[PDB]
């Protein structure tokens, strides 16, 4: 009913009289649904239902950040609760203390740092983001994503020297991880020398996932012509996916 | 048969006592842990200090 749904509401209603079940159901009710969630959901994890809520109000709009304030205070584990909540409040910053609040409650996890970094990055002052990085990284360091933002920070990170060495260590500490490999190849790309990026790009591909490919075909988009075959490997890497790749390609 | 009346006397007295306790509790509600003893204001020491001084603190009493 999914791939068939991908091109059957009722069959899920009788199949319903017959927790990820009512979840995918809610996903179906999307394209209004307010009663569907406020009832079919209210029986029921719940966090996704909060998400979908604040998404609803979000495209609608405050009651969103309200309900975030609800599920958050109810279930303080999935960060994107806060990440969202804040992520609204920031635009209206107070946002930080929201971040920190939820943090100190685990805190000891991973992401909340990453959240806080990116939020600073997004907002500005790369310089503290450096600190936050180095801290959480002292703690964690085998955690890759940290090395991601560590690398992003040299795009305009403007400390030119160490990038080499850092690509070095960012590699070796992390048991060389595809996500980094991408991020390196990018930092080549968004500068120049697109072929340099390739060996990295593919070099990660052998560890595969879409977050690369779009770049891959942007690289070809600067060189190209192997286009057709590798589409097979894409067919192996799995809905309108060709719609997605070609979509994001147009973004650039 | 004295066992019945006796048990009524003991049990009823114990209940009366505990009820007097909790009655004192919600009644005050100095407590104990609350140590509220130190919140209380004794004219005794404060005063007898006061005029005991020559009258102005104990600090500068030297001067006048």
């Amino acid at each position: 009913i999914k791939l068939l749904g991908r091109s059957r509401d009722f069959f899920q209603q009788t199949f319903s009289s017959l927790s990820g079940t009512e979840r995918l159901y809610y996903k179906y009710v999307n394209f209004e649904e307010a009663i569907k969630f406020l009832n079919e959901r209210c029986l029921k994890i719940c966090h996704k239902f909060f998400l979908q809520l604040g998404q609803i109000y979000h495209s609608m709009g405050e009651m969103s950040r309200e309900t975030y304030l609800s599920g958050t205070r109810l279930v303080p584990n999935c960060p994107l609760l806060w990440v969202s909540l804040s992520k609204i409040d920031e635009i209206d910053v107070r946002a930080r203390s929201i971040l920190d609040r939820g943090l100190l409650k685990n805190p000891d996890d991973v992401l909340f740092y990453i959240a806080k970094i990116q939020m600073e990055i997004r907002l500005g002052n790369l310089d503290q983001a450096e600190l936050l990085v180095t801290q959480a990284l002292q703690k964690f360091p085998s955690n890759a994503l940290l090395w991601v933002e560590q690398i992003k920070l040299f795009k305009h990170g403007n400390k030119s020297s160490l990038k080499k060495t850092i690509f070095q260590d960012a590699l070796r500490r992390t048991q060389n991880d595809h996500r980094v490999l991408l991020e390196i190849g990018v930092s080549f790309y968004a500068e120049a020398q697109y072929e340099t990026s390739l060996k990295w790009l593919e070099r990660a591909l052998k560890k595969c996932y879409g977050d690369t490919w779009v770049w891959l075909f942007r690289t070809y988009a600067r060189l190209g012509k192997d286009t057709v075959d590798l589409y097979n490997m894409f067919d192996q890497c799995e809905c309108t996916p060709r719609e997605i790749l070609l979509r994001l390609m147009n973004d650039k | 048969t004295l066992q019945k009346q006796q048990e009524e006397e003991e049990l009823k007295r114990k209940l009366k006592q505990e009820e007097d306790e909790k009655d004192k509790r919600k009644l005050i509600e100095p407590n104990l842990e609350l140590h509220e003893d130190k919140f209380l204001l004794d004219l005794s020491k404060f005063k007898i200090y006061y005029d005991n001084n020559h009258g102005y603190e104990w600090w500068d009493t030297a001067y006048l």
Binding site: V93, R94, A95, R96, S97, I98, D100, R101, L103, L104, K105, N125, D127, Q128, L131, Q135 | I28, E29, P30, E33, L34, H35, E36, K38, F39, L40, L41, D42, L43, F46, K47, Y49, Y50, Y56, E57, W58, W59, D60, Y63
Partner: protein, 358 residues
């Protein structure tokens, strides 16, 4: 020993002090007298309890960014409307209290490491800051202007100056540094009235009293040494501490003082009783203690403590029971103050935010 007189006019100032002192104290003490009359146990028993929840209540609202360094000193102008924030950058600035958005203006000092920064007792347009360099600074905060500007300079500590305070007069200033001397100056003329000696290590911290007569002197030797000003008489001296004192806190009571330092433990030295009611140990945090405050108004009830523990506390003025801790920070906590209205709490630290509390 040496007792050496010199430089009269300060004795004149001391003359001044006396008149200022006795009066307020007298009145003050008298007022305290009044309260004894009223008693009414169950009032306080309720009221205290009430505040407890509010203290348990308090939460971080929004934080901010300020500088890139630890944030060494915060404070509030007496109106509770603005924050003085200096820090290891050597930078100052003044922020909107209730609110925190961004700031009035960020002026960098001429100094690079800032011990503490303090507000004029009345006009509240003026500040003073102790520095790394052995210089002390008077500044003008202009209206809602960003008009942070020199009101003047102060000279002659040869070490870092770890603390400075306005005398409740407002004509008188003090600085405890390292050079093992704590100095008392005229505000107006910007002139030293006093160079005090007597700490076998650096003189770390400083406190006056409401009545302005006593200055408690904290030092780096773990000896909290008390001073009558007008006579320059060491009166009582307090070792409750192993490792150097840091915060010398003073009650509005005027008869009580708190201390904290390397030990990771606070002492309450209650003065008059002086036989043994003496100190009281508060196991305080862990991992040192940085700054300690009594509620400014209200005579002091609440106690506020900032260590490197990364927490911040609330203590009852009498039980001195730990009431609550507030998870405030990612990092260590260099400084704090509190709304004179006792509704807000402002902290700063290593994590470089400046966090506001309910």
């Amino acid at each position: 020993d040496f007792f050496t007189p010199a430089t009269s006019e300060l004795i004149f100032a001391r003359r001044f002090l006396i008149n200022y002192s006795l009066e307020r104290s007298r009145k003050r003490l008298q007022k305290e007298m009044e309260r004894h009359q009223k008693f009414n146990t169950r009032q306080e028993l309720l009221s205290r309890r009430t505040e407890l929840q509010r203290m348990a209540n308090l939460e971080l609202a929004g934080s901010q960014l300020v500088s890139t360094k630890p944030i060494s000193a915060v404070s509030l102008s007496t109106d509770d409307m603005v924050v003085a924030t200096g820090s290891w950058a050597g930078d100052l600035q003044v922020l909107n209290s209730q609110t925190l958005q961004p700031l009035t203006q960020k002026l960098d000092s001429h100094v690079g490491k800032i011990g503490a920064i303090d507000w004029h007792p009345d006009s509240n347009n003026q500040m003073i800051s102790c520095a790394e360099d052995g210089l002390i600074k008077n500044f003008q905060y202009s209206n809602e202007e960003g008009g942070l500007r020199l009101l003047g300079d102060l000279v002659g500590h040869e070490r870092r100056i770890s603390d400075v305070k306005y005398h409740p007069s407002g004509k008188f200033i003090g600085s405890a540094s390292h050079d093992m001397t704590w100095r008392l100056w005229d505000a107006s003329t910007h002139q030293e009235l006093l160079l005090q000696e007597g700490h076998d290590k650096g003189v770390f911290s400083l406190s006056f009293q409401c009545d302005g007569s006593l200055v408690c002197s904290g030092g780096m030797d773990s000896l909290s040494m008390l001073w009558d000003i007008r006579s320059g008489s060491k009166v009582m001296t307090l070792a409750g501490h192993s490792k150097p004192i840091y915060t010398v806190a003073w009650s509005p009571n005027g008869y009580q003082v708190a201390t904290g330092g390397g030990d990771g433990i606070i002492n309450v030295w209650d003065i008059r009783k002086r036989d043994e009611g003496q100190l009281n140990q508060i196991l305080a945090h862990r991992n040192i203690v940085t700054q300690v405050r009594f509620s400014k108004e209200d005579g002091g009830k609440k106690l506020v403590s900032c260590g490197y523990d990364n927490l911040i506390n609330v203590y009852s003025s009498d039980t001195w029971l730990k009431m609550g801790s507030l998870a405030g920070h990612t990092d260590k906590i260099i400084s704090l103050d509190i709304s004179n209205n006792s509704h807000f709490l402002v902290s700063g630290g290593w994590d470089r935010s400046i966090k506001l509390w309910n």
